[PDB]
Amino acid sequence: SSSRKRRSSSSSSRSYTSHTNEIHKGKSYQLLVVENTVEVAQFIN
Amino acid sequence: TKVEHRCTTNKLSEKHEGSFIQGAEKSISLIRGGRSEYGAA
């Protein structure tokens, strides 16, 4: 704003200003192994 | 004489970025016969 009257005058200015950011990451890895070996398969007592 | 001039101004902005991936594997295997060295292999 600027104002002048007669001599006299006044003036002004503004900035409000703002910012925001975010990040996320997520990771998961799950492994199973089940294994059997035999070399005699019926052993019978 | 009197004079007055005035203004107001406004602005906004946004940005977004996204990624996801998923994987799954299964294996099932039956070996019958072999030496267990290579039945293992």
UniProtKB/Swiss-Prot annotation, chain A:
This is Complement component C7. It is linked to Complement component 7 deficiency: A rare defect of the complement classical pathway associated with susceptibility to severe recurrent infections, predominantly by Neisseria gonorrhoeae or Neisseria meningitidis. Residues 3-21 are annotated as: Disordered. Monomer or dimer; as a C5b-7 complex it can also form multimeric rosettes. Component of the membrane attack complex (MAC), composed of complement C5b, C6, C7, C8A, C8B, C8G and multiple copies of the pore-forming subunit C9. Component of the membrane attack complex (MAC), a multiprotein complex activated by the complement cascade, which inserts into a target cell membrane and forms a pore, leading to target cell membrane rupture and cell lysis. The MAC is initiated by proteolytic cleavage of C5 into complement C5b in response to the classical, alternative, lectin and GZMK complement pathways. The complement pathways consist in a cascade of proteins that leads to phagocytosis and breakdown of pathogens and signaling that strengthens the adaptive immune system. C7 serves as a membrane anchor. It comes from Homo sapiens (Human). C-, N- and O-glycosylated. O-glycosylated with core 1 or possibly core 8 glycans. It comes from the Eukaryota. Belongs to the complement C6/C7/C8/C9 family. It is found in: Secreted; Target cell membrane. The lineage of its organism: Eukaryota, Metazoa, Chordata, Craniata, Vertebrata. Residues 7-15 have a biased composition (Low complexity).
Curated annotation (Swiss-Prot), chain B:
All cysteine residues are assumed to be cross-linked to one another. Individual modules containing an even number of conserved cysteine residues are supposed to have disulfide linkages only within the same module. It is found in: Secreted; Target cell membrane. It comes from the Eukaryota. Belongs to the complement C6/C7/C8/C9 family. Component of the membrane attack complex (MAC), a multiprotein complex activated by the complement cascade, which inserts into a target cell membrane and forms a pore, leading to target cell membrane rupture and cell lysis. The MAC is initiated by proteolytic cleavage of C5 into complement C5b in response to the classical, alternative, lectin and GZMK complement pathways. The complement pathways consist in a cascade of proteins that leads to phagocytosis and breakdown of pathogens and signaling that strengthens the adaptive immune system. Component of the membrane attack complex (MAC), composed of complement C5b, C6, C7, C8A, C8B, C8G and multiple copies of the pore-forming subunit C9. It is linked to Complement component 6 deficiency: A rare defect of the complement classical pathway associated with susceptibility to severe recurrent infections, predominantly by Neisseria gonorrhoeae or Neisseria meningitidis. This is Complement component C6. It comes from Homo sapiens (Human). The lineage of its organism: Eukaryota, Metazoa, Chordata, Craniata, Vertebrata. The gene is C6. The chain holds residues 414 to 454 of 934 of the full protein.
